[PDB]
Amino acid sequence: NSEAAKKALNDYIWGLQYDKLNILTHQGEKLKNHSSREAFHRPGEYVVIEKKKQSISNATSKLSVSSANDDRIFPGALLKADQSLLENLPTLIPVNRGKTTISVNLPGLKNGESNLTVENPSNSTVRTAVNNLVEKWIQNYSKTHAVPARMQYESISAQSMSQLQAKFGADFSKVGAPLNVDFSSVHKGEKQVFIANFRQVYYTASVDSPNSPSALFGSGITPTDLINRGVNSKTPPVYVSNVSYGRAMYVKFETTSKSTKVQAAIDAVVKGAKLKAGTEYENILKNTKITAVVLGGNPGEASKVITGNIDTLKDLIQKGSNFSAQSPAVPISYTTSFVKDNSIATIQNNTDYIETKVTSYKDGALTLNHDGAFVARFYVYWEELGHDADGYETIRSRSWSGNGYNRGAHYSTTLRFKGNVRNIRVKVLGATGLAWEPWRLIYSKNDLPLVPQRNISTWGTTLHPQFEDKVVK
Numbered sequence: 001n002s003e004a005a006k007k008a009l010n011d012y013i014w015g016l017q018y019d020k021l022n023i024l025t026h027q028g029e030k031l032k033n034h035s036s037r038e039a040f041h042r043p044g045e046y047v048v049i050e051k052k053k054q055s056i057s058n059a060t061s062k063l064s065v066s067s068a069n070d071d072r073i074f075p076g077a078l079l080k081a082d083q084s085l086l087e088n089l090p091t092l093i094p095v096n097r098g099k100t101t102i103s104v105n106l107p108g109l110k111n112g113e114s115n116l117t118v119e120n121p122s123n124s125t126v127r128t129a130v131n132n133l134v135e136k137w138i139q140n141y142s143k144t145h146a147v148p149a150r151m152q153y154e155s156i157s158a159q160s161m162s163q164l165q166a167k168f169g170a171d172f173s174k175v176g177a178p179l180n181v182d183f184s185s186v187h188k189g190e191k192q193v194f195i196a197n198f199r200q201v202y203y204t205a206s207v208d209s210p211n212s213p214s215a216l217f218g219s220g221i222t223p224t225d226l227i228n229r230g231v232n233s234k235t236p237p238v239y240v241s242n243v244s245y246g247r248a249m250y251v252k253f254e255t256t257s258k259s260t261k262v263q264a265a266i267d268a269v270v271k272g273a274k275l276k277a278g279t280e281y282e283n284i285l286k287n288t289k290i291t292a293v294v295l296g297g298n299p300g301e302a303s304k305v306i307t308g309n310i311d312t313l314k315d316l317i318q319k320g321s322n323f324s325a326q327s328p329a330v331p332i333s334y335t336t337s338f339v340k341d342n343s344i345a346t347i348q349n350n351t352d353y354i355e356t357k358v359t360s361y362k363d364g365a366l367t368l369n370h371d372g373a374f375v376a377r378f379y380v381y382w383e384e385l386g387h388d389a390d391g392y393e394t395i396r397s398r399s400w401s402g403n404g405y406n407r408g409a410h411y412s413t414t415l416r417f418k419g420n421v422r423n424i425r426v427k428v429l430g431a432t433g434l435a436w437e438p439w440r441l442i443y444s445k446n447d448l449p450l451v452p453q454r455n456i457s458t459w460g461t462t463l464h465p466q467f468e469d470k471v472v473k
Contacts, residue, residue, distance in 0.1 A: 012223035013213035028351025046419025076100035096218025108141035147323035247296030
């Protein structure tokens with residue numbers, strides 16, 4: 001009678017065949033291979049705006065709550081695994097539901113205080129019940145139990161709107177729009193832009209895995225009811241298994257520096273290494289323009305854009321680092337699981353894009369010192385990137401003017417290289433003052449890095465030739 005209706009639902013859902021870790025895959029642009037560059041001279045450096053084709057392959061289960069999706073996102077909600085979820089605006093399935101057991105992980109809660117049962121789950125019933133649990137928790141436990149955020153952190157180099165959407169979700173186009181990412185500034189090679197998603201999580205409402213597909217729906221629901229509702233193997237059913245509450249922000253970083261490690265620099269701030277002393281990460285973030293849209297803090301803030309420097313961030317991070325407990329926090333991320341096997345669903349976005357790396361190889365110098373009581377002979381070679389009339393890049397093989405002259409005891413000299421030099425090759429020959437062969441490879445080294453200042457010295461005796469290859473920078 002009832003057993004029969006449930007069973008019929010159970011098998012129908014259990015019956016569905018689909019590629020779990022695949023139907024939730026979005027493909028963006030695909031690009032033809034491409035690798036080009038542009039290099040030029042500017043005092044003290046040779047600059048190279050290099051453009052390559054790259055691909056990003058992003059996989060997430062922790063989906064982000066937005067004002068557009070807000071009303072469909074609540075623990076236990078029935079959605080389809082279709083194009084709408086791929087775009088992060090999932091459609092709820094129009095069907096009577098069954099009891100939903102929900103569990104909130106606020107600390108202090110004991111006995112069955114942490115567990116809720118909602119009769120006819122709707123965005124309304126479930127949110128009321130959840131918040132009412134959170135209102136109880138505040139009055140009773142907030143003064144005695146602290147709630148420090150758990151911080152989810154993702155960041156990336158802004159290259160393309162389509163790449164940002166793979167990393168942050170199709171959503172990102174609108175949610176992030178207030179940040180106005182100037183993509184030409186990256187492509188023109190002037191700026192280096194970054195984007196970070198911060199999710200500061202105070203608490204989560206996790207739904208208990210139901211005893212069977214049947215339990216998610218109302219009594220009297222039928223495989224036919226779901227066939228008609230388009231709940232099938234093309235577009236199988238999922239449920240919101242978790243909803244995380246707190247405060248989240250999207251942040252844009254704008255350097256003019258052309259450094260490598262900016263990402264690791266930003267990563268360093270976030271990650272506990274607060275005020276890194278010395279000199280490296282410090283002297284990069286010093287000149288960074290922080291722009292942040294926040295979500296959770298107040299009601300009416302997806303508006304209020306925040307501007308400042310690296311410090312204006314750390315203060316935004318610390319302001320949300322703990323749960324103030326004035327009132328229930330707002331949803332900021334959720335998870336779906338397939339009804340069939342309760343497995344967390346993963347959204348995957350792949351796309352192709354044009355990366356723009358800007359690089360600077362600075363002027364450097366090479367000091368050769370001979371101090372030994374034997375007859376030395378230096379040999380230095382390298383190549384020189386230039387351009388022709390038509391604009392294409394040229395390679396000129398060059399050698400030192402001092403190649404193979406005999407050097408005496410007090411010798412010294414400095415060859416200065418501009419940034420467009422590469423393949424630096426040093427050979428040194430000392431005299432063994434004998435008949436059958438008179439020179440020996442004292443020191444050879446190919447592909448020498450163009451460091452600001454390198455000393456290659458010599459000394460000792462005709463038997464034991466000494467030498468040192470040291471950087472001074």
